[PDB]
Amino acid sequence: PIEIPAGVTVTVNGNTVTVKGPKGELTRTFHPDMTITVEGNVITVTRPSDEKHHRALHGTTRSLLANMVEGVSKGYEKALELVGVGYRASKQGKKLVLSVGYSHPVEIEPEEGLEIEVPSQTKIIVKGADKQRVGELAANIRAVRPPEPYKGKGIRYEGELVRL
């Protein structure tokens, strides 16, 4: 079973599961053949048979739930860094404002369930409960102005190896 940490509320309705927590809320549907139940303090997954496809479905369903529980409790994040003189980021409302060498700034507003933090003018942190959506928004930010080959200016992931 999956342990429901504190602060986390799990709701099951047929094949749709909703998990809420301090870091966010996520709703997910699972394979019909799988039975999901909140057994007091733990989430249990019961497969219909012992054939292989079910055994595989069972472990796959279990993992997804575990990660849904990890996301709203612990949350996920991806950091990016700005490299280049005059290149800076700031937070104006829910919006990320980027000054990356164009005539005017680029403003990005995260969708629902996503946050963007700017702890220093050259560091951007994207966070949320869905690891995928976090990965996707950070790739979209970097894509505004990826690192150029001669000097490495642009936006790069925090540990991005971009040798000039």
Coordinates of N, CA and C in Angstrom, one line a residue:
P1 N 0.8 -1.2 0.0 CA 0.0 0.0 0.0 C 0.9 1.3 0.0
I2 N 0.2 2.4 -0.3 CA 0.9 3.7 -0.3 C 0.5 4.5 1.0
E3 N 1.5 4.9 1.7 CA 1.3 5.6 2.9 C 0.8 7.1 2.6
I4 N -0.3 7.5 3.2 CA -0.8 8.8 3.1 C -0.1 9.7 4.1
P5 N 0.8 10.6 3.8 CA 1.5 11.4 4.8 C 0.5 12.4 5.3
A6 N 0.9 13.1 6.3 CA 0.1 14.1 7.0 C -0.2 15.3 6.0
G7 N -1.3 15.9 6.2 CA -1.7 17.1 5.3 C -2.2 16.6 4.0
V8 N -2.1 15.4 3.7 CA -2.5 14.9 2.4 C -3.9 14.2 2.4
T9 N -4.8 14.6 1.6 CA -6.1 14.1 1.4 C -6.3 13.3 0.1
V10 N -6.7 12.0 0.2 CA -6.8 11.2 -1.0 C -8.3 10.9 -1.2
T11 N -8.8 11.1 -2.4 CA -10.2 10.8 -2.7 C -10.3 9.9 -3.9
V12 N -11.1 8.8 -3.9 CA -11.2 7.9 -4.9 C -12.7 7.8 -5.4
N13 N -12.9 7.8 -6.7 CA -14.3 7.7 -7.2 C -14.2 6.9 -8.5
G14 N -14.4 5.6 -8.3 CA -14.3 4.7 -9.5 C -12.8 4.6 -9.9
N15 N -12.5 5.0 -11.1 CA -11.1 4.9 -11.5 C -10.3 6.3 -11.5
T16 N -11.0 7.3 -10.9 CA -10.4 8.6 -10.9 C -9.9 8.8 -9.4
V17 N -8.7 9.2 -9.2 CA -8.1 9.5 -7.9 C -7.7 11.0 -7.8
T18 N -8.1 11.6 -6.7 CA -7.7 13.0 -6.5 C -6.8 13.0 -5.2
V19 N -5.6 13.6 -5.3 CA -4.7 13.8 -4.1 C -4.5 15.3 -3.9
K20 N -4.6 15.8 -2.7 CA -4.4 17.2 -2.4 C -3.3 17.2 -1.3
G21 N -2.6 18.3 -1.3 CA -1.5 18.4 -0.3 C -1.0 19.8 -0.3
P22 N 0.0 20.1 0.6 CA 0.5 21.5 0.6 C 1.1 22.0 -0.7
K23 N 1.7 21.1 -1.5 CA 2.3 21.5 -2.7 C 1.4 21.5 -3.9
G24 N 0.2 21.1 -3.8 CA -0.7 21.1 -5.0 C -1.8 20.1 -4.9
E25 N -2.6 19.9 -6.0 CA -3.7 19.0 -6.1 C -3.6 18.3 -7.4
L26 N -3.8 17.0 -7.5 CA -3.7 16.3 -8.8 C -4.7 15.2 -8.9
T27 N -5.4 15.1 -10.0 CA -6.4 14.2 -10.3 C -5.9 13.3 -11.4
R28 N -6.1 12.0 -11.3 CA -5.6 11.1 -12.3 C -6.6 9.9 -12.4
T29 N -6.7 9.4 -13.6 CA -7.6 8.2 -13.9 C -6.6 7.0 -14.1
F30 N -7.0 5.9 -13.7 CA -6.2 4.6 -13.8 C -7.0 3.5 -14.6
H31 N -6.2 2.5 -15.0 CA -6.8 1.4 -15.7 C -8.0 0.8 -15.0
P32 N -9.1 0.7 -15.6 CA -10.4 0.1 -15.1 C -10.2 -1.1 -14.3
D33 N -9.4 -2.0 -14.8 CA -9.2 -3.3 -14.1 C -8.6 -3.2 -12.7
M34 N -8.0 -2.1 -12.4 CA -7.4 -1.9 -11.1 C -8.4 -1.4 -10.1
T35 N -8.4 -1.9 -8.8 CA -9.2 -1.3 -7.8 C -8.3 -0.6 -6.8
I36 N -8.7 0.6 -6.6 CA -8.0 1.5 -5.7 C -8.9 1.9 -4.5
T37 N -8.3 1.7 -3.3 CA -9.1 2.0 -2.1 C -8.2 2.7 -1.0
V38 N -8.8 3.6 -0.3 CA -8.2 4.3 0.8 C -8.5 3.4 2.0
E39 N -7.6 2.6 2.5 CA -7.7 1.8 3.6 C -7.3 2.6 4.9
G40 N -8.2 3.4 5.4 CA -7.8 4.3 6.5 C -6.7 5.3 6.2
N41 N -5.5 4.8 6.6 CA -4.3 5.6 6.4 C -3.4 5.3 5.2
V42 N -3.7 4.3 4.4 CA -2.9 3.9 3.3 C -3.8 3.6 2.0
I43 N -3.2 3.8 0.9 CA -3.9 3.6 -0.4 C -3.5 2.2 -0.8
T44 N -4.5 1.3 -1.1 CA -4.2 0.0 -1.5 C -4.6 -0.2 -3.0
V45 N -3.9 -1.0 -3.8 CA -4.2 -1.3 -5.2 C -4.5 -2.8 -5.3
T46 N -5.6 -3.2 -5.8 CA -5.9 -4.7 -5.9 C -6.1 -5.0 -7.4
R47 N -5.4 -5.9 -7.9 CA -5.5 -6.3 -9.3 C -6.6 -7.5 -9.3
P48 N -7.3 -7.7 -10.5 CA -8.3 -8.7 -10.6 C -7.8 -10.2 -10.6
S49 N -6.6 -10.4 -11.2 CA -6.0 -11.7 -11.3 C -4.5 -11.7 -11.1
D50 N -3.9 -12.9 -11.3 CA -2.4 -13.0 -11.2 C -1.7 -13.2 -12.5
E51 N -2.4 -12.9 -13.6 CA -1.7 -13.1 -14.9 C -0.6 -12.0 -14.9
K52 N 0.2 -12.1 -16.0 CA 1.3 -11.1 -16.1 C 0.8 -9.7 -16.3
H53 N 0.0 -9.4 -17.3 CA -0.4 -8.1 -17.6 C -1.0 -7.3 -16.4
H54 N -1.6 -8.1 -15.6 CA -2.2 -7.5 -14.3 C -1.1 -7.2 -13.4
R55 N -0.2 -8.1 -13.2 CA 0.9 -7.9 -12.3 C 1.7 -6.7 -12.7
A56 N 1.8 -6.4 -14.0 CA 2.6 -5.3 -14.5 C 1.7 -4.0 -14.4
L57 N 0.4 -4.1 -14.5 CA -0.5 -3.0 -14.4 C -0.5 -2.5 -12.9
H58 N -0.5 -3.5 -12.0 CA -0.5 -3.3 -10.6 C 0.7 -2.5 -10.1
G59 N 1.9 -2.9 -10.5 CA 3.1 -2.1 -10.1 C 3.2 -0.7 -10.7
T60 N 2.7 -0.6 -12.0 CA 2.7 0.7 -12.7 C 1.7 1.6 -12.0
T61 N 0.5 1.1 -11.7 CA -0.5 1.9 -11.0 C 0.0 2.4 -9.6
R62 N 0.6 1.5 -8.9 CA 1.2 1.8 -7.6 C 2.3 2.9 -7.7
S63 N 3.1 2.8 -8.7 CA 4.2 3.9 -8.8 C 3.5 5.2 -9.1
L64 N 2.6 5.3 -10.0 CA 1.9 6.6 -10.3 C 1.3 7.2 -9.1
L65 N 0.7 6.4 -8.2 CA 0.1 6.9 -7.0 C 1.2 7.4 -6.1
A66 N 2.2 6.6 -5.9 CA 3.3 7.0 -5.1 C 3.8 8.4 -5.5
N67 N 4.1 8.6 -6.7 CA 4.6 9.9 -7.3 C 3.6 11.0 -7.2
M68 N 2.3 10.7 -7.2 CA 1.2 11.7 -7.0 C 1.3 12.1 -5.6
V69 N 1.5 11.2 -4.7 CA 1.6 11.5 -3.2 C 2.9 12.3 -3.0
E70 N 4.0 12.0 -3.7 CA 5.3 12.7 -3.5 C 5.2 14.1 -4.0
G71 N 4.5 14.3 -5.1 CA 4.3 15.7 -5.7 C 3.6 16.7 -4.9
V72 N 2.4 16.3 -4.3 CA 1.7 17.2 -3.5 C 2.2 17.4 -2.1
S73 N 3.1 16.5 -1.7 CA 3.6 16.6 -0.3 C 5.0 17.2 -0.4
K74 N 5.9 16.7 -1.2 CA 7.2 17.2 -1.4 C 7.4 18.1 -2.5
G75 N 6.5 18.0 -3.5 CA 6.6 18.9 -4.7 C 7.8 18.6 -5.6
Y76 N 7.9 19.1 -6.8 CA 9.0 18.9 -7.7 C 9.5 20.3 -8.2
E77 N 10.8 20.4 -8.6 CA 11.3 21.6 -9.1 C 12.4 21.5 -10.1
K78 N 12.6 22.5 -10.9 CA 13.6 22.5 -11.9 C 14.2 23.9 -12.0
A79 N 15.5 24.1 -11.8 CA 16.1 25.4 -11.9 C 16.8 25.7 -13.2
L80 N 16.8 27.0 -13.6 CA 17.5 27.5 -14.8 C 18.3 28.7 -14.4
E81 N 19.3 29.0 -15.2 CA 20.2 30.1 -14.9 C 20.4 31.0 -16.1
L82 N 20.5 32.3 -15.9 CA 20.7 33.3 -17.0 C 22.2 33.6 -17.1
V83 N 22.8 33.6 -18.3 CA 24.2 33.9 -18.5 C 24.3 34.9 -19.6
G84 N 24.8 36.1 -19.2 CA 25.0 37.1 -20.1 C 24.8 38.5 -19.5
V85 N 25.7 39.4 -19.8 CA 25.6 40.7 -19.2 C 24.3 41.4 -19.6
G86 N 23.6 41.9 -18.5 CA 22.3 42.6 -18.7 C 21.1 41.6 -18.7
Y87 N 21.4 40.3 -18.7 CA 20.4 39.3 -18.7 C 19.9 39.1 -17.3
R88 N 18.6 39.4 -17.1 CA 18.0 39.2 -15.8 C 16.5 38.9 -15.8
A89 N 16.1 38.3 -14.7 CA 14.7 37.9 -14.5 C 14.1 38.5 -13.2
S90 N 12.8 38.8 -13.2 CA 12.2 39.4 -12.1 C 10.7 38.8 -12.0
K91 N 10.1 39.0 -10.9 CA 8.8 38.5 -10.7 C 7.8 39.8 -10.6
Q92 N 6.9 39.9 -11.5 CA 6.0 41.0 -11.5 C 4.6 40.3 -11.4
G93 N 4.1 40.1 -10.2 CA 2.8 39.4 -10.1 C 3.1 37.9 -10.2
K94 N 2.1 37.2 -10.9 CA 2.3 35.8 -11.1 C 3.3 35.6 -12.3
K95 N 3.5 36.7 -13.0 CA 4.4 36.7 -14.1 C 5.9 36.8 -14.0
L96 N 6.6 36.0 -14.8 CA 8.0 36.0 -14.9 C 8.4 37.0 -16.0
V97 N 9.3 37.9 -15.7 CA 9.6 38.9 -16.7 C 11.1 38.7 -17.0
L98 N 11.4 38.4 -18.3 CA 12.8 38.1 -18.7 C 13.4 39.2 -19.6
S99 N 14.6 39.6 -19.3 CA 15.3 40.6 -20.0 C 16.5 39.8 -20.5
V100 N 16.4 39.3 -21.8 CA 17.4 38.4 -22.4 C 17.9 38.9 -23.7
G101 N 18.2 40.2 -23.9 CA 18.8 40.6 -25.1 C 18.0 40.9 -26.3
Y102 N 16.7 41.1 -26.2 CA 15.8 41.4 -27.3 C 15.4 42.9 -27.1
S103 N 14.7 43.5 -28.0 CA 14.5 45.0 -27.7 C 13.6 45.1 -26.5
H104 N 12.6 44.2 -26.3 CA 11.7 44.3 -25.1 C 11.7 43.0 -24.3
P105 N 11.2 43.0 -23.1 CA 11.2 41.8 -22.2 C 10.2 40.8 -22.6
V106 N 10.4 39.5 -22.2 CA 9.5 38.4 -22.5 C 8.8 38.1 -21.1
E107 N 7.5 38.1 -21.2 CA 6.7 37.8 -19.9 C 6.0 36.4 -20.0
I108 N 6.2 35.6 -19.0 CA 5.6 34.3 -19.0 C 4.8 34.1 -17.8
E109 N 3.6 33.6 -18.0 CA 2.7 33.4 -16.9 C 2.4 31.9 -16.7
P110 N 2.7 31.3 -15.6 CA 2.5 29.9 -15.5 C 1.0 29.6 -15.4
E111 N 0.8 28.3 -15.9 CA -0.6 27.9 -15.9 C -1.0 27.5 -14.5
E112 N -2.2 27.0 -14.3 CA -2.7 26.6 -13.0 C -1.9 25.4 -12.5
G113 N -1.5 25.4 -11.3 CA -0.8 24.3 -10.7 C 0.7 24.5 -10.8
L114 N 1.2 25.5 -11.4 CA 2.7 25.8 -11.6 C 3.1 27.2 -11.0
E115 N 4.3 27.2 -10.4 CA 4.9 28.4 -9.8 C 6.2 28.6 -10.4
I116 N 6.7 29.8 -10.4 CA 8.0 30.2 -10.9 C 8.5 31.1 -9.8
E117 N 9.7 30.8 -9.3 CA 10.3 31.7 -8.3 C 11.6 32.2 -8.9
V118 N 12.0 33.4 -8.5 CA 13.2 34.1 -9.0 C 13.9 34.5 -7.7
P119 N 14.7 33.7 -7.1 CA 15.5 34.0 -5.9 C 16.6 35.1 -6.0
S120 N 17.2 35.1 -7.2 CA 18.2 36.1 -7.6 C 18.0 36.4 -9.0
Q121 N 18.4 37.5 -9.5 CA 18.2 37.9 -10.9 C 18.7 37.0 -12.0
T122 N 19.5 36.0 -11.7 CA 20.0 35.1 -12.7 C 19.6 33.7 -12.5
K123 N 18.6 33.5 -11.6 CA 18.2 32.1 -11.2 C 16.6 32.1 -11.3
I124 N 16.1 31.1 -12.0 CA 14.7 30.9 -12.1 C 14.3 29.4 -11.6
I125 N 13.3 29.3 -10.7 CA 13.0 27.9 -10.3 C 11.5 27.7 -10.6
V126 N 11.2 26.6 -11.3 CA 9.8 26.2 -11.7 C 9.5 25.1 -10.7
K127 N 8.3 25.2 -10.1 CA 7.8 24.1 -9.2 C 6.4 23.8 -9.3
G128 N 6.0 22.6 -8.9 CA 4.7 22.2 -8.9 C 4.6 20.7 -8.5
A129 N 3.4 20.2 -8.5 CA 3.2 18.8 -8.1 C 3.3 17.8 -9.2
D130 N 3.2 18.2 -10.5 CA 3.3 17.3 -11.6 C 4.7 17.5 -12.2
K131 N 5.5 16.4 -12.0 CA 6.9 16.4 -12.5 C 7.1 16.7 -14.0
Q132 N 6.1 16.2 -14.7 CA 6.1 16.4 -16.2 C 5.8 17.8 -16.6
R133 N 4.8 18.4 -16.0 CA 4.4 19.8 -16.3 C 5.5 20.8 -15.9
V134 N 6.2 20.4 -14.8 CA 7.4 21.2 -14.3 C 8.5 21.1 -15.4
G135 N 8.7 19.9 -15.9 CA 9.8 19.7 -16.8 C 9.5 20.5 -18.1
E136 N 8.2 20.4 -18.6 CA 7.7 21.1 -19.8 C 7.8 22.6 -19.7
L137 N 7.4 23.3 -18.6 CA 7.4 24.7 -18.5 C 8.9 25.2 -18.5
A138 N 9.8 24.5 -17.8 CA 11.2 24.9 -17.7 C 11.8 24.7 -19.1
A139 N 11.4 23.8 -19.9 CA 12.0 23.6 -21.3 C 11.5 24.8 -22.2
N140 N 10.3 25.2 -21.9 CA 9.7 26.3 -22.7 C 10.3 27.6 -22.3
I141 N 10.7 27.8 -21.1 CA 11.4 29.0 -20.6 C 12.8 29.1 -21.3
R142 N 13.5 28.0 -21.1 CA 14.9 27.9 -21.7 C 14.8 28.2 -23.3
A143 N 13.8 27.7 -23.9 CA 13.6 27.9 -25.4 C 13.4 29.3 -25.8
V144 N 13.1 30.2 -24.8 CA 12.9 31.6 -25.2 C 14.2 32.1 -25.8
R145 N 15.3 31.7 -25.1 CA 16.6 32.1 -25.6 C 17.7 31.1 -25.1
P146 N 17.8 30.0 -25.7 CA 18.8 28.9 -25.4 C 20.2 29.5 -25.5
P147 N 21.2 28.8 -24.8 CA 22.6 29.2 -24.8 C 23.3 29.2 -26.2
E148 N 24.0 30.3 -26.5 CA 24.6 30.5 -27.8 C 26.0 29.9 -27.7
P149 N 26.5 29.2 -28.7 CA 27.8 28.5 -28.8 C 29.1 29.3 -28.6
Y150 N 29.1 30.6 -28.9 CA 30.4 31.3 -28.8 C 30.7 31.7 -27.4
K151 N 29.7 32.1 -26.7 CA 29.9 32.6 -25.3 C 29.0 32.0 -24.2
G152 N 28.1 31.1 -24.6 CA 27.2 30.5 -23.7 C 26.1 31.4 -23.1
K153 N 25.8 32.5 -23.8 CA 24.8 33.4 -23.3 C 23.4 32.8 -23.6
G154 N 22.5 33.1 -22.8 CA 21.1 32.7 -23.0 C 20.7 32.1 -21.6
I155 N 19.7 31.2 -21.7 CA 19.1 30.5 -20.5 C 19.5 29.1 -20.6
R156 N 20.0 28.5 -19.5 CA 20.4 27.1 -19.5 C 19.9 26.5 -18.2
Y157 N 19.7 25.1 -18.2 CA 19.3 24.5 -17.0 C 20.4 24.7 -16.0
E158 N 20.1 24.6 -14.7 CA 21.1 24.8 -13.7 C 22.4 24.1 -13.9
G159 N 22.4 22.8 -14.1 CA 23.6 22.1 -14.4 C 24.0 21.8 -15.8
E160 N 23.5 22.7 -16.8 CA 23.8 22.5 -18.2 C 25.2 22.7 -18.7
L161 N 25.8 21.6 -19.2 CA 27.1 21.6 -19.7 C 27.1 22.2 -21.1
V162 N 27.5 23.5 -21.2 CA 27.5 24.1 -22.5 C 28.9 24.8 -22.6
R163 N 29.8 24.0 -23.1 CA 31.2 24.5 -23.3 C 31.2 25.4 -24.5
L164 N 31.8 26.6 -24.3 CA 31.9 27.6 -25.4 C 32.9 27.0 -26.4

